[PDB]
Amino acid sequence: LAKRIIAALIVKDGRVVKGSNFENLRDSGDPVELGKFYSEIGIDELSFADITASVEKRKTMLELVEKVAEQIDIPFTVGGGIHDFETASELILRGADKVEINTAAVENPSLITQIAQTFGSQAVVVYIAAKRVDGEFMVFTYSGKKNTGILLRDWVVEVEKRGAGEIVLGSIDRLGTKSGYDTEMIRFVRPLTTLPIIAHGGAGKMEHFLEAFLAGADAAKANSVLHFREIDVRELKEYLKKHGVNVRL
Secondary structure, X not given: OOEEEEXXXXXXXXXXXXXXXXXXXXOOOOHHHHXXXXXXXXXXXXXXXXXXXXXXXXXXXXXXXXXXXXXXXOOEEEEOOOOOHHHHXXXXXXXXXXXXXXXXXXXXXXXXXXXXXXHOHHHEEEEEEEEEEOOEEEEEEOOOOEEEEEEHHHHHHHHHHHOOOEEEEEEOOOOOOOOOOOHHHHHHHHHHOOOOEEEEOOOOOHHHHHHHHHHOOOEEEEOHHHHOOOOOHHHHHHHHHHOOOOEOO
16 A cells, blocks of 8 residues: 555666666666666665567576575565466576566466466566557557557556456556656556556656555656656655655654
């Protein structure tokens, strides 16, 4: 019933893509050092998205979750190119608390159930990339390239039915725009599912977070606005608690 602030880091070959602005770390491109720092200053969870050349990807993603699990204590999700049960399983066993799946889940919905039966719904996070097309919310796969023809409304329902723990709701429209979260999309989805909704795409200033939590989101995923300190984590939670948002310290 508390809201969460989730720091999201894109990584490739064990490196924070386009790094960060905290000069106070020996390495501002070290995902591990950044992520532990974010944990100290009050990030509620981490989320790593790997985009490594698929040849060294599997080894590289397991290297990362191991390195991370050694140094941090808050939940963290790992995602990106996870296509089957065994890849998710070894990533969780190696340290990750949850995995984030999207395209594999749309093509094979039972993949949500298979991961959940062994690691529990809490470990399965489904990323839903939606966009408005002819007045309807549509689900997109392959990093935005494929309109699946599936309605957001139906996918959200099926994703809970299959046993997902949480849903990351990405507004494609708003991705990388600093214009605010797609609160219209969030309000559309909110009554369709009992699951936690993690809002992604559009953050630019602290009030967007208030707007998003007012819309019904249980958490907020945030990317470059964090790393380039266009928003401070402490000021944000200050702000939201001040205006009645139930955040943790």
